[PDB]
Amino acid sequence: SAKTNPGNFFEDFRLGQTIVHATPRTITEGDVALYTSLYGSRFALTSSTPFAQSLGLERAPIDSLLVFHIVFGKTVPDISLNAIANLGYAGGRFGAVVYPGDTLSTTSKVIGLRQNKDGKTGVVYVHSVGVNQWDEVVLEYIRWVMVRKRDPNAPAPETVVPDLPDSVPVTDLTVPYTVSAANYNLAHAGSNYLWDDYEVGEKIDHVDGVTIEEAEHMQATRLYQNTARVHFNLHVEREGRFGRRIVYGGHIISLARSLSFNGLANALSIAAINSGRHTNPSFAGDTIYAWSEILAKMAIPGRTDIGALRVRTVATKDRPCHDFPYRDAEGNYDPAVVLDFDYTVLMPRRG
Amino acid sequence: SAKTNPGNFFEDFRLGQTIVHATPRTITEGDVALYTSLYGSRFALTSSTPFAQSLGLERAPIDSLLVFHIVFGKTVPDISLNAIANLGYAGGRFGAVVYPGDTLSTTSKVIGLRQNKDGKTGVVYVHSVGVNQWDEVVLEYIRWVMVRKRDPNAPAPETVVPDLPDSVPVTDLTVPYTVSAANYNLAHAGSNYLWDDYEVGEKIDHVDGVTIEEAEHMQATRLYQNTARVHFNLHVEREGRFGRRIVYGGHIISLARSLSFNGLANALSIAAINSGRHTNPSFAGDTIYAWSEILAKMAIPGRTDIGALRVRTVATKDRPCHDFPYRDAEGNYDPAVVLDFDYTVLMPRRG
Amino acid sequence: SAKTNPGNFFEDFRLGQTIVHATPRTITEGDVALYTSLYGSRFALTSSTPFAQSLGLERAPIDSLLVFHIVFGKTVPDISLNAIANLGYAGGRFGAVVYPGDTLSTTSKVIGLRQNKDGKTGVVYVHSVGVNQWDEVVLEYIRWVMVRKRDPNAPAPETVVPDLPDSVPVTDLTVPYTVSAANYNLAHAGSNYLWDDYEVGEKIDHVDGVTIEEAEHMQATRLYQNTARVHFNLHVEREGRFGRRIVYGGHIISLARSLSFNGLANALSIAAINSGRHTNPSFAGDTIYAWSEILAKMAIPGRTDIGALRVRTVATKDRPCHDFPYRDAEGNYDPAVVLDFDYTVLMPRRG
């Protein structure tokens, strides 16, 4: 009897099953430095312990997206090892703050199944939950993936598709730090623009472009202990249609967030992920650019020191001539667009 | 008088000489994270402090192979700077557990010399010993290397070839942690298969393949402070026969071990290295695959919670069509085989 | 109103203005390990906490050049984002020792301006100062950069060019540790050659060559949170004259220092930078070699355990046939020379 883990194929999933993932992970200062070296994020909250402490935190917290990729990575062996694509995310709520020394474990529950019409693949919806060593939820989200059937002839499960929240409600957001004007260094943060100064509907060109190297995305993907084979195996991928390894979609999210520092410097942390589409594949040699739109501005119940912004950041490769490329082609994404990421940031307010 | 260190050439070695190596090295959480990011190892013991503590350890220990490469790397300037190849390892016994914050220093003793028949090179056998800051041995092993003679005409030393142990005896293995069923999370470890469930002679295909990047092996080699010039210098190596830099053999060992997680997840740590042959050179652009055989299963004297398995892991590049490639050609390794690694793991037993 | 930071162009600078830079940075053991993995530095002071403690330090200090690149990187968004080239450094004095856990912030003052004769660019001189969380200066230096004018027609500022020190005076050097023969392990340090044994005017060939990978310099540059766009953007740089990304000049400094270990092993730390010229651009695929000259030997006032050496290290690419390439062409640097770095090291003296 085979000792190896073939992962799950579509027909292997059962509605309501809970999967306890392997490899709980202690997150350390080594992880923090690697993440910095891979994306260049300049957000002051994660770079400086004294800055984080002036906001009432114990020390600089782990980047929310580093938390996300680690939680996501744990689920890969059991959920997406045999997936064609990730199809979306919803209800991504960040919970307790994560600090160096904390240990995360992940479990996933199947909350939806739908065999595709061609009968060769199916969509599985999972609710994934990451907890720390105290059993506090640090992150929960829903994602859905298109997964291969091992046997095309296997019977279809009954279709169950869950209702998906459009966004994490502002009343569900964790706001784990506190800001006072008397204690917030704008020069250190990197911008004079605060929550009050952003205009709903405004678009922001982040300007910078960064080229992806093979060693770079593989190294981030290994940091996440994410094992999906399209990222790693040139011997196989070279025979595939693209003929090259595919960059982990979350690597693009992390680059876009880093680039967004140019124009969203006071967006100190990500408090929720509302949706995310990896609209086209990204490859080593592609240069990633980003732009953002302020979709909405929302007050935080009970707080006037910090507000929320709902942001769409769109990543493109090798930026084309028309500014702010999106969906010119009647709902169809521009071929240059690789990421459509809709999330909620916290930003200090004027006092 | 030259201020530089030319290393030793074959005629420079003296039977019985002890060399105290430079650059003692404190191993930190930054080293741990880098090692994870370079090999993607998912073994639960090294990834989680609470998991390691439930086994009675202080915190997650340093990966045995990270310990190995660091000890090995220290010896490179004095032993193998002028080597053509490493020829083998024997009696590699892991001693005291290594934790973040510990500092390793290495010494080597010459225990064998044999000038080659063509008189252009010679074989030197060394016993290398790594100790921590408390002077406890954390690792000892024997290796032998083919080293260039600086002067072809220099007189041959008297041939002395030591007796080499076939394996580290099970009675010599350190078993630094303790397992109880009541306290061992199988889902977290990543497999239901325990020591009792493995069959002697069984072969395990680890399935996954991973492609080596230049930046990747150079970065691991620098982490080890290993200075061998074939790894680094394209200007020189490009003129060589292979016409490209050569991947540190130990990088292949570390990849194979990582890949072995798929099928040997409960092999929590490596307790001994019995032999190791780098059968063919490996290069950036090669995709590494692995398979393992259970050579033997052995009880640990005085213990029923943990057992030993003697494992051969064979790494191949760009896996050929016949499964489990080894030595079809009458003792000659298949051209695809790059590593033949024979070692002993500890695995929890059923209670 | 644009939310992004266009940086400063030449006409934007005002004599005497102080710029407080963004992104204060806590330096951790993760940064230490990454720096090791990127340059392979074997200097014993930074690799071993017990070695550093035997010299009276708290623990192993952060590499002086890691401190330098971080301080430098912070200034990039405001000073050199729109620069054509860095033109020189002067009066680079290292102050308080930096340890893991310390946090650095940087400010720059404009101390000089001179519009170039073609009126398209100008030279700006800055005094940059890095302090730790206790407001102690850990590094100060002067650098000057050639910066683009946004508007060629903008009026020239009045020319003010500061007097530049030729070197940091020996009386200004911080000597933060203490050596005694009774407590200095030469084998661990890596050389028997001490301050007394070096000859003024002697030249040292460091022998080793190392090839730069794209992922490697980008990763170092991100570790420094240095955002200059020539390092990152192939989409843009591919259209440029060189047609490829340009390696951060400080990456070359750090490689040269690492290579210098072969011949300057007891040069335990860099106490000052006197001048530095990036004489030709460096690119991924270039192999870097180094050689050094002992320019001067100086006693440290009040101390006989440690002395200073003023060193020139010259880095070359793909080393040409004539040894010690420098300025054959009548003041013009040899096309192979990429770095001319003049600095002061501390070295233990014989007792």
From Swiss-Prot, chains A, B, C:
Keyword check for Lyase: yes
Pfam families, A to Z: MC_hydratase
Residues covered by the MaoC-like domain: 15-128
Signal peptide per UniProt: none
Origin: domain of life: Bacteria
Record-annotated membrane-spanning stretches: none
EC number assigned by the record: 4.2.1.148
Record field: pH dependence: Optimum pH is 7.5.
Alphabetized CDD domains for the sequence: FkbR2
UniProt-listed PANTHER family: BETA-METHYLMALYL-COA DEHYDRATASE (PTHR43664:SF1), MONOAMINE OXIDASE-RELATED (PTHR43664)
Record text on subunit structure and interactions: Homodimer.
Protein name, entry field: Beta-methylmalyl-CoA dehydratase
Species annotation: Chloroflexus aurantiacus (strain ATCC 29366 / DSM 635 / J-10-fl)
Gene label: mch
